[PDB]
């Protein structure tokens, strides 16, 4: 019930981006596929 | 004037070959399905 | 539920989280947890 509310102020009209405006929620934020950013090598001290 | 009246067309053995319904064609019988038809429902629930 | 307290007794609080079974009303309203809703809480002392 608290991971559902819109993430202010990203639901405002003062958002220059358009993509995050409609999915600026908590549940849909668990995937970075739609955010287009990716990591190079997420290994931990060389331990995988 | 109808509750004790034969109900068409299940009276005719020629028309309907199932003898149980023909014997129990009386509309009085429909209430006593627990003792005439022995079919029950899973639960008397309704919308939780 | 109920809460216990009195003028004579001293400070207390539970570290853990009291748990309540609330399945039936959600099934009644046909409202999944992810849907839109809220709670309303009322507290009333024993003396009225
Ligand atoms: C009931 O008890 C509460 C305890 O805080 C008190 O504030 C209130 O005045 C009491 N009311 C009556 C009618 O006894």
How many A from CA of C1 to the centre of ligand 1?
Answer: 19
Pocket test for ligand 1, best of C4, C45, C46, C48 (most atoms within 8 A of CB): C45
Q: What is the DSSP string of C1-48?
A: ------SSS-----SS------HHHHHHHT--TTSS---------TT-
> Across the A/C interface, how many CB contacts are shorter than 8 Å?
7
Q: Give the CA angle between residues C10, C15, C16 to the nearest 5°.
A: 130
| Beta-carbon contacts of residue A11 (< 8 Å; ≥ 6 apart) | A21, A24
What is the rounded distance in angstroms from the CA atom of residue A6 to the CA atom of residue A21? Answer: 10
Task: Look up residue C42 and give its two tokens.
Answer: 């009322």
Q: Name the 3-class secondary structure at B28.
A: helix
What is the rounded distance in angstroms from the CA atom of residue C38 to the CA atom of residue A1? Answer: 8
Cβ contacts (< 8 Å) between A6 and chain C: which residues? none
Resolution for this PDB entry, in angstroms? 4.4
Q: Name the 3-class secondary structure at A44.
A: strand
Whether the CB of C13 is below 8 Å from some CB of chain A: the reply is: no
Count of other CB atoms within 10 angstroms of residue B24: 16
Residue B21 burial by Cβ neighbours in a 10 Å radius (0-12, 13-18, 19+): middle
CA-closest candidate to residue B22, choices B37, B34, B40, B6: B6
Cβ contacts (< 8 Å) between A1 and chain C: which residues? 33, 37-39
């Amino acid at each position: 019930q608290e991971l559902r509310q819109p993430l202010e102020p990203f639901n405002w009209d003062s958002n220059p981006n358009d993509f995050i405006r409609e999915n600026a929620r908590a549940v849909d934020a668990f995937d970075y596929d739609q955010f287009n950013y990716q990591y190079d090598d997420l290994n931990f001290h060389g331990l995988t | 004037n109808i509750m004790r009246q034969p109900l068409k067309p299940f009276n005719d053995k020629g028309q309907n070959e199932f003898d149980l319904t023909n014997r129990y064609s009386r509309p009085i019988d429909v209430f006593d399905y627990s003792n005439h038809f022995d079919y029950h429902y899973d639960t008397l629930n309704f919308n939780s | 539920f109920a809460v216990l307290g009195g003028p004579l007794e001293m400070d207390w609080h539970f570290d853990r989280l009291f748990q309540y079974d609330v399945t039936s009303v959600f099934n009644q309203m046909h409202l999944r947890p992810d849907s839109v809703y809220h709670f309303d809480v009322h507290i009333t002392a024993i003396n009225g």
